[PDB]
Subunit: 65 residues, 6 copies
């Protein structure tokens, strides 16, 4: 929405390394390649499709905006 999109898009455009924490406790790390209404593609060695419904928090490695 009005916050989530610009936030993720800024992270995407600025290629900021992020830590994505899943609801189960697992921590994912990488950079946001792209995202749509339901998923986020996290890129590194091999990219992976993360369902937003499985995400708890997105923590940037450095301050943004």
């Amino acid at each position: 929405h009005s916050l989530q999109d610009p936030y993720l898009n800024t992270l995407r455009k600025e290629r900021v390394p992020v830590s994505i924490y899943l609801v189960n406790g697992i921590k994912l790390q990488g950079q946001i390649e792209s995202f749509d209404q339901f998923v986020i593609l996290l890129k590194n060695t091999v990219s992976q499709m993360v369902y937003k419904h499985a995400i708890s928090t997105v923590v940037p490695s450095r301050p943004v905006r």
Copy 2:
């Protein structure tokens, strides 16, 4: 959102420290910088975007007046 929006907006506007408990049991702390229909941006020692679907409760450090 007749209650949620005014509540979160008051916490935000008044810089009220809050504790956000996640469904998995993890406790997040800080002040609400902004929010929308699905996420809340928390800031202080660790700035982060929290998905509401992962939140169980939001406990203000002090009660909120609407």
Copy 3:
């Protein structure tokens, strides 16, 4: 709708309740207010609880059902 009048009765009559979360945690207090997605619980700890994180709402006494 049954959820709304049920909650409104608990609210209006200031009935003490126990709100059990999906993670097993038990919250206690009286419902101060609520909307489509959240419930504001108050007494010992004032907090906004997301309904999506609630498993059950158990009143301390029987109440008029809708």
Copy 4:
């Protein structure tokens, strides 16, 4: 809801004791007093409102048609 509603209504009307297992593993028991799109009211000692999103299964104590 061509199946859910008739099923729950049958259990409600016939007052069939049921076991409602929650997604977290807890087992609730009693009779279905009523239900709507999102919740089910279960009666035992005091009635409790159960959110369907927290329910995994509804198991009747005896078979029903």
Copy 5:
């Protein structure tokens, strides 16, 4: 939409294929799909229990199906 799910469940139902339904909490239910709608599946063995799809992780047939 349901171009895969519906035909899949209906085939399992019509052919009475033994199936295992794994829930998100880890529970494994066994039996056969007797019926289903948009939100639930009726699984039959000892008694027919209603399973909410939201609580299901996977549906695994006892044998391949076409």
Copy 6:
């Protein structure tokens, strides 16, 4: 949509993938088919996986992205 073309690439190229569920369980195989709500995973035993129970889809090798 980003999800559909991505899943379709995995499907068409028959790419080996790991599907991690929200409860931490790891499933392996390949995407045989999918619709708006489910994915058909093929390996030693085929199974229908509900997307709501999936946390991440990880291919065994880099693939073309949407």
